[PDB]
């Protein structure tokens, strides 16, 4: 029978944290994140930490998780992933119970239901550390992944620090599914093991487009017995806590027969000494061929792990180093230095997956709007983007990393997002021996009208053209589809691809593509100008003052900026509906674009406030009219619940574009206050009153629910497309930071608070310590502003 389940005692609340909450705090420098917590206790949700390679990567929770893939995410995966808040059990655990007492110790809190015993982890900056004190015995787990070489690494070092020589047992468990979904690969996956070499390989051949990976665990140490069954390892009526594995017999036979469940196991006794530790080092990789397999354990096992490790340390300092501030916010620097950057490249670089989302398919949209927060990676992928180009003028919105293949949509914004960026780097780079390369063209079997994509096969052609006929040829797209009003059609949708159907076939348009479309076109006809190409300048000049002329005349409610219309010619965004009452993306691009009047500016921008007075929820709310009936069939945000995600809920990517308008402007109190309001540090949440929230604090959330009794609670977490822009905004807006021409300029609105702050920036090699006063200075030399 089962025995019940033990409450935990609580646990106090130390010193040395900054923001001390129930579970955990910053441990200064903003660099380590410590969660203390006691047995049968954990937090909300999952806190995630994720840690990546090029070609690998895995994320840990506080309370252990993992999720390892080699080649790309939903097509290649080694452990299981569970989105699930309330159990998640693991599919990785590591048990270091005693052999004579048989008590079982875990250094992980889900693991273990003891509620005596000390549990502690530790998620830094590129590795993340788990210790656990259970009755005078000491376990700790180190995590952390290689360069250039796809494998993990796990520690686990045992400290004996009690009075009598213990014999101690370690188990080390992992789950094998690889494929997108699970109970679809494990009657057909096949796990080997060898003699000589201590390592278990695992294969799945029935994967259709992986029929050659193979995965490995292996130790630094000789293996006494290992297993490959779950019906042995766990069996019958027994759970994670309690294994069965380890109570009736302490022996594992070696079997190769298959099962319906795949595991993985390595056995060593250890005999430690009072005062005695001993290193263990565990390997998580796979490689495709035996051959190859075989090579890269015989190399990690004798290379070694800790050169790794701190290898990591200097390459995640270093790369989140280059700039940091001082500023006296005890949140800004422990989260804007550090955990900005280090979320931004750990997840729209590296690994594009969360704990509650993924997502293997690179975005066009995406990757443009990503690296523009920091140079030659921003390069590197304007030029893969600009190879997804067809002849015809339409852009490839999604694609695999490796064969390329992927769908081509009708959407309308994508193929302008390549404009903005040749622009933005034109503007700080300077280089304009970018725009004149040669990007072969990719051949498709076209889209029907009467569908939304088509997958396909691309093929490549010989016919290759310059970036800048690239951005020229998709911008005349842009051009041909604009309707009746004047206004770029919508077509296959906007920035928002949750508003969809509100064109195909019809005269639905956005007001917010056309902004954009002016502000990209703005700096085009500059750029061709200086190509010389007076032919495509004379009619891009031509339909800019149309577009302006109707975005000026008919693109005004009265008192703020329309949406778009419908297809029946509705307005939206309009007071008339009774939804879609406000849309901050207009309101806020009206701005940033640098069009329009300054006066309609300002008259926009204090309707923006309408939906700002939600202090309570803590939110910028995108719309202020909840979505429940569908009285024109706007898309299929109708099926997102009221106050959830974009049906007038918490949109952080279009959140921070008020923060940048309004400090454009030089409402830098209002943009202070929504920045504090955006941040999710010291979001309501301080010590234990926003339990509600459940979400991480150190890291920027997209959606956070605003609207119901269940309102205050953030959602998708750790896969945002905030991240860079909060970023850019903390330097540009709240800062006055920035590199227009490859010069440093000073142009600061400092905080009323703040008083003063004092940044280090190295670029080019040179490290400059920039400190700003109450109104103009700095370090090295008193200097005029903007110089």
């Known amino acids: 029978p089962v025995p019940a389940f033990p409450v935990a005692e609580p646990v106090e609340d130390a010193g040395d944290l900054d923001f001390w909450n129930g579970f955990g705090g910053f441990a200064k420098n903003g660099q380590e994140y410590v969660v203390r917590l006691n047995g049968g206790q954990s ?137 997108n979904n699970g109970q679809k690969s494990a009657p057909f996956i096949l796990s080997r093991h060898d003699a000589g070499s201590n390592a278990i390989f695992a294969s799945n051949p029935y994967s259709i487009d992986y029929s050659a990976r193979t995965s490995f665990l292996t130790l630094d140490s000789e293996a006494s017995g290992f297993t490959t069954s779950r019906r042995e390892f766990i069996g019958r009526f027994g759970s994670a806590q309690a294994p069965q594995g380890i109570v009736a017999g302490a022996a594992l036979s070696g079997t190769t027969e298959v099962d319906g469940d795949p595991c993985a196991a390595l056995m060593q006794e250890i005999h430690l000494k009072p005062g005695e530790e001993r290193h263990m080092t565990f390997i998580l990789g796979d490689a495709d061929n035996a051959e190859e397999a075989e090579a890269l354990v015989k190399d990690v096992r004798q290379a070694d792990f800790l050169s790794v490790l701190e290898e990591s340390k200097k390459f995640w300092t270093g790369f989140t180093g280059q700039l940091q501030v001082s500023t006296p916010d005890a949140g800004f620097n422990h989260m804007v230095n550090n955990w900005l950057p280090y979320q931004a490249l750990a997840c729209r670089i590296l690994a594009r997956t969360a704990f509650y989302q993924s997502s293997g398919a690179f975005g066009f949209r995406d990757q443009l709007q990503d690296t523009l927060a920091f140079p030659d990676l921003a390069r590197t992928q304007i030029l893969r983007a600009a190879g997804r180009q067809f002849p015809e003028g339409d852009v490839q919105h999604w694609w695999l990393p490796l064969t390329g293949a992927g769908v081509r949509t009708t959407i309308s914004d994508d193929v302008v997002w390549l404009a903005y960026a040749i622009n933005q780097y034109v503007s700080a780079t300077g280089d304009a021996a970018i725009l004149d390369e040669s990007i072969p063209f990719l051949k498709g079997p076209a889209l029907m009208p009467g569908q939304h994509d088509a997958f396909f096969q691309p093929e490549t052609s010989e016919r290759s053209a310059t970036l800048y006929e690239h951005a020229a040829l998709a911008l005349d797209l842009a051009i041909h589809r604009t309707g009746e009003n004047g206004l770029p059609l919508i077509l296959g949708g906007d920035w928002n691809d949750g508003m969809n159907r509100v064109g195909v076939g019809g005269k639905g348009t956005s007001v917010w593509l056309g902004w954009f479309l002016a502000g990209a076109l703005r700096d085009f006809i500059e750029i061709a100008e200086k190509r010389g190409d007076t032919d495509r300048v004379g009619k891009w000049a031509s339909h800019r003052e149309k577009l302006r002329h109707v975005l000026e005349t008919a693109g005004w409610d009265g008192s703020y900026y329309r949406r778009g219309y419908f297809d029946d010619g509705t307005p939206l965004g309009s007071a008339s509906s009774e939804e879609c009452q406000i849309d901050s993306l207009g309101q806020s691009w009206s701005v940033l674009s640098g069009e329009g009047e300054e006066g309609r500016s300002r008259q926009a921008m204090d309707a923006v406030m309408e939906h700002l007075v939600d202090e309570k929820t803590g939110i910028i709310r995108l719309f202020t009219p909840p979505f429940s009936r569908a009285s024109h069939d706007p898309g299929y945000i109708k099926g997102y619940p009221p106050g959830v995600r974009e049906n007038g809920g918490q949109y952080t990517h279009a959140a921070t574009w008020v923060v940048l308008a309004l400090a454009k402007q030089g409402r830098a109190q209002e943009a202070w206050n929504c920045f504090k309001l955006l941040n999710p540090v010291n979001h309501a949440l301080d010590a234990a009153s926003s339990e509600t929230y459940r979400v991480e604090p150190y890291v920027v959330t997209a959606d956070v629910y605003g609207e119901g009794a269940y309102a205050g609670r953030g959602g998708w977490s750790w896969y945002t497309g905030s991240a860079g822009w909060l970023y850019r905004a903390a330097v540009e807006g709240i800062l006055g930071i920035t590199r227009t021409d490859g010069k440093l300029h000073v142009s600061p609105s400092l905080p009323e608070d703040w008083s003063g702050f004092s940044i280090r920036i190295t670029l080019d090699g040179k490290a400059r310590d920039i400190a700003v006063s109450r109104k103009a200075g700095t370090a090295d030399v008193s200097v005029s502003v903007d110089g």
């Open 43 to 179: 937090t909300p949700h999952p806190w995630i930490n994720v840690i990546s390679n090029e070609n690998f990567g895995f994320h840990i929770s506080a309370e252990g998780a993992g999720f390892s893939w080699s080649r790309n995410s939903r097509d290649y995966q080694l452990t299981p992933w569970t989105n699930d808040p309330v159990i998640n059990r693991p599919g990785e655990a590591f048990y270091v119970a005693d052999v004579e007492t048989g008590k079982l110790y875990t250094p992980c809190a889900a693991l273990s239901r003891d509620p005596e015993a000390m549990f502690e982890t530790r998620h830094g900056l590129g590795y993340s550390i788990l210790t656990g004190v259970a009755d005078t015995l000491e376990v700790e787990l180190t995590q952390t992944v290689d360069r250039e070489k796809p494998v993990k690494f796990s520690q686990v070092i045992v400290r004996n620090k009690g009075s009598k020589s213990r014999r101690l047992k370690v188990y080390a468990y992992v789950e094998w599914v690889l494929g």
